[PDB]
Design a binder for this molecule. Structure first.
Ligand SMILES: [Mg+2]
Ligand SMILES: [Mg+2]
Ligand SMILES: [Mg+2]
Ligand SMILES: [Mg+2]
Ligand SMILES: [Mg+2]
Ligand SMILES: [Mg+2]
Lengths: 156, 129, 205, 121, 76, 78
RNA sequence: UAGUUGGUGGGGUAAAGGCCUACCAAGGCGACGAUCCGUAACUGGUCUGAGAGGAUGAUCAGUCACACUGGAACUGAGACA
RNA sequence: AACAGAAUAAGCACCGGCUAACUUCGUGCCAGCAGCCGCGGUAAUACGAAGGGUGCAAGCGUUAAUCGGAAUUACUGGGCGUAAAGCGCGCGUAGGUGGUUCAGCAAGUUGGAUGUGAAAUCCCCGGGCUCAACCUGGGAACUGCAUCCAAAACUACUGAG
């Protein structure tokens, strides 16, 4: 589906000769409010056209996320580049408390109780990779129990 | 001159599940032969054999539910030179109770789910997911 | 310190009904609630992300009439109690005495209920209370003092109860004027325009 | 670093020092003034800043800065200085409170009067 | 209360000196160091050798800096 | 001597005493051996005025503890 | 570092001790930081921190140290007041 | 409890970006501003004013001083091919770590009991002042140290291979 959310806008450039050609980039994540997200990056020549391009690439190559219901399954920790990310599920009344670019991922996924923090280099185009290695590699235990459930899930 | 044997059993397991091997053979001891019994009962390997006479070996067969293996990570906790000891209150839980943690207690090598039922603390060895 | 001044102007910035004017005459006829106040009431665009959370916090804080030194005091008692600080923050604003006088219907505005408490005209357990912060419990028999039962401020306001209904955690008696706070409210009688997941997140950073 | 090195030589946290070295742990300080220069700023500006030099009751001889729009500060007059680092001028590290003892504030000012010390009309 | 150490000195008169080892843990880095202890046990009969393994206990002071005594020699 | 006497806690014009057993040459609010009860003169509603415990008062008074003037009656009115 | 570190004999004090003295002996401590320099009354606690920790010891409470500066004893249950 | 009458009683910083909230008028590299980026050379949403607006309120602002943010002294929680960072290379004392079978022991380790860890403070459930601050009853906690009892997997010590 489609619920859109913008994060970043830049002004990249390019020197040719004579002057300097400008261009705009944008980063936009799209989710469904249930656990299907997708991010997208587009470059164009103006703001109202660079956002439209980044929205279209978001709703291609999406991710199914197996959330527990407004929370996560377990504390995990993933990294990409020089960016390290930590996330652990929380109680009911606590909302989402994260920084800038992990709120926009964790809104549209539908989770509400995420309690996150990012270390290392804060790059909004690169902390998103650090988040999607984490969420796309969840497990959601298909087991008979948890304190007992290590005889039917390990064979899954 | 290897200083720690049990961080070498776990290293060969982690490496063989990237070369996509099936059988792994390392030298044995009376502790490694008890750890692999615990990983079998929790279920991460197929079986294990102590089959020699003067250099007794340990032949472990690995599992693959997918192209991805069944063990995804494993690290040694009580490295020789740290010696991590834990009571029952401060005993850790990995992944909200979905991994296993192996604790050498007063009643033998058993997992974290077993000794916490018996209420006996001890010494951590590893945190297998 | 209260807030004394214009009162459509608060409803005119946040862009909602907000229930501040007294009578059932008309919204947006005394008020003209089409635009942001001030000179530049026509230009708009892109409320900031911090500015959204402050806009939600300032909305809830102007329905009821608190100030921020008091409002953070309620936020500490929310995080003390067990579970769901968003719901607990609302139920400490519902049990306050100036709200329950408004829920029983002894006033038109909520600011009228603040003045009826302040002039010792309201009792709680059979004894006089003149504090607009008194946290009432379940089963407190709020009644009206006999020296002022003849005020037209109370008599007229009961015809303004017709456009309100009963909130189904109180009960009011139109003869002796003695309401009964039955129990705590639930998280269904409150409107969905307020959000319990923006005020909690504002007080982190 | 390994654990057996940190036992032998533990991690020693480095310390800073005060950007205001004079007026040792106190918010204000008085002093009598000596000279009223009018110096020039650094390169990317162009102005003529007004700088007085003060001898405190500590005995220190530090330069200061005077704000506002016009000062009556003849020499040998007491002032009351406070901290504040002017980025423009070099060596200037202290402002000067208006309206406190001798400087007597400014006049015809109606925006931000608690700064610069002006009354209410 | 009863300690155990090994002798390092026979130079004084009716006075012996022990080393009592000890493993205290470091308060913040979680590692068991070894830190020593050196007492003056009151010898009584001038008959212990450098390198023994003896046993001490605490009495009232006999000289200054000498309040421990000798229980018995355990092994050579 | 040792003695059983009254401390003083609470705000202005609302006292709340404490039956302590102290050495005699101490302060009022200073050190004490132990504490055994309280005394609340302005007790109203669900509050209790006298709350002395008779076990330790059996113990100390048999070993030469010397009570005060108010404590001469508060142990009596139990 | 030479009553310095032990031993012995005698004194001395409510009380063990180089506490003191007479001879004997040449020991004692130290890189696990002695010695020396610079600063500072310590503690239960306060202030931040998710936590580990980090700073800090106003009011209240416990302990120590002084009573213009440097000494000194008496009286006495108990002071070097 | 009664009487008088709406009478007896509102400021302060900010509005270019971080950062909620804006346009005209003076000024023209002058005066001036400033926590950092930096504005001012004749049209200044940054200086000085005027309207408007936003934050807080019997207070609001600046300065001084600590801890956070700082995974920026990293035990929990970082680094060393080129960004700062591997001694010019050896040998070796103190010290740190120890292949594999039994057997013993119980110093570490786990579990339990007792003595202690002053009261206050913090935390939890209550109770009093018209509410709250404040006062106060009962509990937990004070991570500790010591003495006993038991267990024996691993480390240590001991005996044999
Ligand atoms: Mg931190
Ligand atoms: Mg008036
Ligand atoms: Mg201006
Ligand atoms: Mg830190
Ligand atoms: Mg070597
Ligand atoms: Mg206590």
């Amino acid at each position: 589906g489609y619920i859109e959310k913008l994060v970043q806008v830049n002004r990249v450039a390019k020197t040719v000769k004579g002057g300097r050609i400008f261009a705009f980039t944008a980063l936009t994540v799209v989710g469904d409010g249930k656990g299907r997200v997708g991010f997208g990056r587009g470059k164009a020549r103006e703001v109202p056209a660079a956002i439209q391009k980044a929205m279209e690439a978001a709703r291609r190559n999406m991710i199914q996320v197996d959330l527990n219901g407004t929370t996560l399954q377990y504390p995990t920790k993933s990294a990409h580049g020089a960016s390290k990310v930590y996330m652990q599920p929380a109680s009911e009344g606590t909302g989402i408390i994260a920084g800038g670019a992990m709120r926009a991922v964790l809104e549209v996924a539908g989770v509400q109780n995420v309690l996150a923090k990012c270390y290392g280099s804060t790059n909004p185009v690169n902390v998103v990779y650090a988040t999607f290695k984490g969420l796309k590699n969840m497990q959601a235990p298909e087991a008979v129990a948890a304190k007992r459930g290590k005889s039917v899930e390990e064979i899954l | 001159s290897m200083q720690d044997p049990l961080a070498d059993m776990l290293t060969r397991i982690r490496n063989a599940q990237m070369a996509e091997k099936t059988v792994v053979s390392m030298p044995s001891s009376k502790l490694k032969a008890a750890v692999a019994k615990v990983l079998k009962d929790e279920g991460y390997i197929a079986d294990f054999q102590i089959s020699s006479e003067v250099k007794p070996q340990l032949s472990i067969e690995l599992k693959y539910f997918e192209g991805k293996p069944v063990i995804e990570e494993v690290k040694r906790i009580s490295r020789p030179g740290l010696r991590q000891y834990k009571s029952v209150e401060q005993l850790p839980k990995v992944r909200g109770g979905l991994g296993v943690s192996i604790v050498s207690t007063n009643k033998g090598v058993m997992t974290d789910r077993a000794a916490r039922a018996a209420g006996v603390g001890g010494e951590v060895l590893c945190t297998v997911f | 310190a209260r807030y004394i001044g214009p009162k459509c102007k608060l409803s005119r910035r946040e862009g909602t009904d907000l229930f501040l004017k007294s009578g059932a005459r008309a919204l947006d006829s005394k008020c003209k609630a089409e635009n942001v106040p001030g000179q530049h009431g026509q230009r708009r665009g892109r409320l900031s992300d911090y500015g959204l959370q402050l806009r939600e916090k300032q909305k809830v804080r102007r329905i009821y009439g608190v100030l921020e030194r008091q409002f953070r005091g309620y936020y500490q008692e929310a995080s003390r109690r067990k579970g769901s600080t968003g719901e607990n923050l609302l139920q400490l604003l519902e049990c306050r005495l100036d709200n329950v006088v408004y829920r029983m219907g002894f006033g038109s505005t909520r600011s009228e209920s603040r003045q009826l408490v302040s002039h010792k005209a309201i009792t709680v357990n059979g004894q006089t209370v003149n504090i607009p912060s008194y946290q009432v419990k379940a089963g407190d028999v709020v009644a009206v003092r006999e020296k002022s039962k003849n005020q037209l401020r109370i008599a007229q306001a009961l015809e303004l109860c017709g456009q309100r209904g009963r909130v189904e955690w109180v009960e009011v008696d139109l003869d002796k004027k003695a309401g009964t706070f039955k129990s705590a409210p639930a998280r269904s009688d409150l409107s969905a325009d307020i959000n319990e997941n923006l005020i909690v997140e504002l007080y982190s950073k | 670093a390994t654990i057996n090195q940190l036992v032998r030589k533990p991690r020693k946290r480095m310390v800073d020092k005060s950007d205001v070295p004079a007026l040792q742990n106190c918010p204000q300080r008085r002093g009598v003034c000596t000279r009223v220069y009018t110096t020039t700023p650094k390169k990317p500006n162009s102005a003529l800043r007004k700088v007085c030099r003060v001898r405190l009751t500590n005995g220190f001889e530090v330069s200061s800065y005077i704000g506002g729009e016009g000062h009556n500060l003849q020499e040998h007059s007491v002032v009351l200085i406070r901290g504040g680092r002017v980025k423009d001028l070099p060596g200037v590290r202290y402002h000067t409170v208006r309206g406190s003892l001798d400087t007597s504030g400014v006049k015809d000012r109606k925006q931000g009067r608690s700064k610069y010390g002006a009354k209410r009309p | 209360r009863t300690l155990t150490g090994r002798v390092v000195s026979d130079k004084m008169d009716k006075t012996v000196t022990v080393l009592i080892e000890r493993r205290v843990k470091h308060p913040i880095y979680g590692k068991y160091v070894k830190r020593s202890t050196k007492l003056h046990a009151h010898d009584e009969s001038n008959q212990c050798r450098i390198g023994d393994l003896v046993t001490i206990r605490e009495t009232r002071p006999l000289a200054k800096t000498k309040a421990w005594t000798l229980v018995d020699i355990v092994e050579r | 001597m040792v003695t059983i006497r009254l401390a003083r806690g609470g705000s202005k014009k609302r006292p709340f005493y404490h039956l302590t057993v102290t050495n005699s040459r101490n302060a009022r609010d200073g050190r004490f051996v132990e504490r055994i009860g309280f005394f609340n003169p302005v007790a109203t509603g669900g509050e209790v005025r006298l709350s002395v415990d008779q076990e330790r008062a059996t113990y100390w008074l048999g070993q030469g503890a010397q009570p005060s003037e108010r404590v001469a009656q508060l142990l009596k009115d139990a």
